[PDB]
Design a binder for this molecule. Structure first.
Ligand code: NA
Ligand code: NA
Ligand code: NA
Ligand code: NA
Length: 331
DNA sequence: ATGTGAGT
DNA sequence: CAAACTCACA
């Protein structure tokens, strides 16, 4: 058990790095696609590949990748990948990409202009948009881990402010934090209200009222993006008078229809492996579960009509599963 | 009925 | 989990 391999990680590591190079250093979408699928199919392969020709029999694996595998099998390396690794251009592109807001397109532009380091970026803030400038301002903070006792404190300020606005609101911090992790890198809040449903007249101000109120108490300090259903921004714990100021953190807040809430909470509580195991069991029972709904499945293996859900428990009830605590949703 | 770049 | 989905901006 077993579970995943583990058996050809060296090959698949090579191909994924090659894909990332071609996607976002070269502008070569087809090469990127081909490496990605070749990596994915090899990763499923239950035997330790001993030649390029053995890999070649797989669909997705052609002559060029088979030859790269020989070189990598024979030597312990691929010269082509050692050169990419040593390449200043590609390394600079990948570093700049760590800034939230900067992606391959803006990274290519910046490196072509000689912008490669944080210091370089901190001297050319006029080349960046608001998202990227906020990404840069807090670059160090946004790579920092977030202790659990911090997440909890963050939890009951957004939970409390939301209540004092209107007790009808339901807000939940999901992600690994919900499933019990000793640290996260981000806070992921799911928000809803009884008179926003998938059939209703929308009412955009549900999300804005809570965002505004969190800025008002100085929890939210910056905005990366903000629409009628989705907010992404920055928050901070209140510092103690003077002394140590807490690092700034990424927080997302998402408004979801009431009749779709618990499927979202379920889906964004994870974990990824749990989720896969759960939708797999659902299929065994004749149900399909996604982030929005759970639907029965018909004789022809296809049906719909969302089932009523006002609880995580309800989803479990339908697939005849004992309710699983988030605390034990690792697998 | 804008297209792309990003982030999740 | 990739894919689709939001949102920002040129
Ligand atoms: Na990125
Ligand atoms: Na300048
Ligand atoms: Na999280
Ligand atoms: Na996240």
């Amino acid at each position: 058990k077993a579970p995943q391999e583990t058996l050809n990680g060296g090959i698949t590591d090579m191909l994924v790095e090659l894909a990332n190079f071609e996607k976002n250093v070269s502008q070569a979408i087809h090469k990127y696609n081909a490496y990605r699928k070749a990596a994915s199919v090899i990763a499923k392969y239950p035997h330790k590949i001993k030649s390029g020709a053995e890999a070649k029999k797989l669909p997705g694996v052609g002559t060029k990748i088979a030859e790269e595998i020989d070189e990598f099998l024979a030597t312990g390396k691929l010269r082509k990948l050692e050169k990419i690794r040593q390449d200043d251009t590609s390394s600079s592109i990948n570093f700049l990409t760590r800034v939230t807001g900067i992606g391959p397109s803006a990274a290519r532009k910046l490196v072509d202009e000689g912008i490669k380091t944080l210091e370089d970026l901190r001297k050319n803030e006029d080349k960046l948009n608001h998202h990227q400038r906020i990404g840069l301002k807090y670059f160090e903070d946004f790579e920092k881990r977030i202790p659990r006792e911090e997440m909890l404190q963050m939890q009951d300020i957004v939970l409390n402010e939301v209540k004092k606005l209107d007790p009808e609101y339901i807000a939940t911090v999901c992600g690994s934090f919900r499933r019990g992790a000793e640290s996260s890198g981000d806070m992921d809040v799911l928000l809803t209200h009884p008179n926003f449903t998938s059939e209703s007249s929308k009412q955009p101000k549900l999300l804005h009222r809570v965002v505004e109120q969190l800025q008002k108490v100085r929890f939210i300090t910056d905005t990366l993006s903000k629409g009628e259903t989705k907010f992404m921004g920055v928050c901070q714990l209140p510092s103690e008078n003077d002394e140590n100021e807490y690092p700034h953190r990424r927080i997302d807040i998402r408004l979801i229809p009431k009749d779709q809430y618990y499927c979202g909470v379920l889906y964004f509580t994870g974990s990824d492996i749990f989720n896969k195991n759960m939708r797999a069991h659902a299929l065994e029972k004749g149900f399909t579960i996604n982030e929005y709904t759970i639907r029965p499945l018909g004789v022809t293996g296809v049906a719909g009509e969302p089932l009523p859900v006002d609880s995580e428990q309800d989803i479990f009830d339908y697939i005849q599963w004992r309710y699983r605590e988030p605390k034990d949703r690792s697998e």
